[PDB]
Each structure stands twice: as structure tokens, then as C-alpha cells.
Design a protein around this nucleic acid. Sequence first.
DNA 1: TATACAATGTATCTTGTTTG
DNA 2: ACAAACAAGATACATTGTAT
Lengths: 63, 63
Amino acid sequence: SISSRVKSKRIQLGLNQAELAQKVGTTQQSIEQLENGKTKRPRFLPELASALGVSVDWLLNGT
Amino acid sequence: SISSRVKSKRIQLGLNQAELAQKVGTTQQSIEQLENGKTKRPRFLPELASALGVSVDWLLNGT
DNA sequence: TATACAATGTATCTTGTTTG
DNA sequence: ACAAACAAGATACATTGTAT
């Protein structure tokens, strides 16, 4: 799940929702709504996936 | 722009906004604003790149 | 026909505050 | 005071219905 997936990778690169959230150009909370399943298709999905080193598809449909 | 690239890459596929909206899993209306600059980052962007047989970056930055 | 316009609803974003 | 969450008010995008 896109929340499990973004959380697990974030922890992995060893970042925190605020730092990730700078990399993504977004905010902590925005990164939070995401990770806590409060959003599904955020505007920065593309830019999130690139901060995470994965693909917008893997992110979406775990692949 | 993305509105621009969506138009052409659909124009050359013989799909109408409506039957493109059909593959993309969306309305014609939704395909119209995008192509017509009414929306920047559509949420069906992943499936779109997939109906236009391109990559989300190409669509996005045209690069 | 095929595309566009318009309003209303809903997702997501923002900023402020909050609890661990 | 550090890090993750809650919550109201704002905009961007979607949906529906209609019209060029």
C-alpha cells in the first residue's frame, strides 16, 4: 500500500517526514496525510517517487 | 506544456477526447480541461502516460 | 458529432496547533 | 524542545449537466 511503501522507503534512506518533505518540495503534514492514508493521489507523487528513488508506478500499485 | 503534449499525442492516435477519457479511466470533461490548460497536475496522470504510450516525465516536462 | 463551458462537489493543501 | 499527528479553512481538480 502506497502508505506502507512511502514509509518503508523513507525510514530506509533514513529520513524524517520533514526532511523528505523538503526533498519533495512539500510539507511535513503533506507527507503525513500521505503516510497516514489521508490522501491517495497527491500532487507531488512524481516528485515524491524521485526523492524516494522509485517509480510512480511501484508507489501506486506496489510494482 | 502538458496540455499541449496530450493533445498532439492523442491527435496522432485517432482517439477522441472521449475515447481517450475511456482508456485513461476518466471523463471527456476531465481530458478537456487538461488539454485546455484548466488543470496542471491531473490525478489520472499515471494512466494517461499509459494511454498516450509515453512516460510521466515526458508528459510533464516534455523533456 | 466532438469539444467546450459552468456550477457544485470532493480531494488535497495549508497553516496552526498538538500530542508523544 | 525534537518528531509525528489533528483539524479548520483554502484551492485545485473532478463531475455532472448543458451548449456551442
